[PDB]
Design a protein around this ligand. Sequence first.
Ligand code: NAG
Ligand code: NAG
Ligand code: NAG
Lengths: 212, 234
Amino acid sequence: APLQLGNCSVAGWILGNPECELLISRESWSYIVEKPNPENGTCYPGHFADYEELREQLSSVSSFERFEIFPKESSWPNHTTTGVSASCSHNGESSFYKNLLWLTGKNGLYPNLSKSYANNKEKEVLVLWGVHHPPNIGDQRALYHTENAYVSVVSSHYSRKFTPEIAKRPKVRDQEGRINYYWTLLEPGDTIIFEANGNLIAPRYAFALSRG
Amino acid sequence: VLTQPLSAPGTPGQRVTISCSGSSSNVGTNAVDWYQRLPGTAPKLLIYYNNQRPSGVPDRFSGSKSGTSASLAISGLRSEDEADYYCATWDNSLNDRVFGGGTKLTVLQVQLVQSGAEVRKPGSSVKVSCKASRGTFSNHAVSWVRQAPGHGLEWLGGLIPIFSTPHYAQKFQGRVTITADESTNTVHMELSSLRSEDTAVYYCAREIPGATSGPDHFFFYGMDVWGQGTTVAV
Ligand SMILES: *[C@@H]1O[C@H](CO)[C@@H](O)[C@H](O)[C@H]1NC(C)=O
Ligand SMILES: *[C@@H]1O[C@H](CO)[C@@H](O)[C@H](O)[C@H]1NC(C)=O
Ligand SMILES: *[C@H]1O[C@H](CO)[C@@H](O)[C@H](O)[C@H]1NC(C)=O
């Protein structure tokens, strides 16, 4: 039984675009039906890393449940997670991806964070996250209280360190910012570690899955 | 909400300091602004981003912030300093702009043009407009603020310069509509289902952005330029 994504792109649906809780939560599917021009995807402009690969890996799925990998009310006691954006406006009001959280400063501080997750779900777990690129150093200080920031995601197959590139861009959907999106499959048994002192667009929900 | 001492004495020359105490949802984490309001005139931005003076402000005004409490400091205290001082910031959890109750101090370029100072019966609605010149609402948030006579400042809401999306303070959602016609460089506040509770002077103000690329609330770091006010009576 095929999976309709409506007017959404795989990016939007999987990120949790606000115009994307839309839909009939399904547990399994064979192939995926998506418009060539999907209108609601990366509501906040930016590059989705290894997008074509992800669309293949998701093309065929036998089990699929969403679950809250890093719970909003206990994971981030030293960081602000309330921020929302008019770039992700649902029904008129500002909002954000349901599967991510925009961490920003709290009490004038953005403490070094490191939070980890061990896969205990006996299925591959798809983990998504973003990194924010502000267009100037004024924004950078305002959101994260640090001029030089890093994000580091590390598992047994994944190891990358992002530094945000800060400079002028063209406006897409009235935004100068970019968020770059990233994803890794987390094998049952592996542990993924996020470390950052700024710019992390943190995962909130993730997905357990299988492919036949 | 922000607690201010209700009153503050001062004598010329001497240095006086207003204080503003908040929760962490506000003040604690977000930038704090201070406004001064003399009578008849419009409120004036003294300090934004905790400690920044906008141009045209004497070295006499200084601002600081520590933990959950900010402070406005006047050092050479003229007589023309006698006015109401307000204290402002964003509050997460409320997700709104939020004003101090006010302190009365007692002793011993872009332009916005609001229009339509007018009268109305209860139950009706009003549409105030605000036109820009030698400047724009293109890369700036605009705020609407009212003051009921013998009351403090009160944020009705704002316009974020991304898809022209409105943002309505809790107390007002459902009654307020804010819109823009950018061809005419004007912003419009329409308040409906009026009542005497709403008779006030209404103001339109442009916000200094703390960040243009972040969550909405970083657009509102300080109202530096104000309309003239529009009086509305019910
Ligand atoms: C989606 O279809 C087109 C744009 O893709 C648009 O005319 C219409 O309003 C949208 N309707 C849906 C599916 O929400
Ligand atoms: C979804 O499509 C509607 C209609 O075209 C548009 O107004 C809205 O901006 C889109 N969602 C996002 C991500 O902005
Ligand atoms: C910040 O406080 C939280 C409260 O749970 C704590 O878990 C965390 O370790 C603290 N961060 C540090 C140690 O800087």
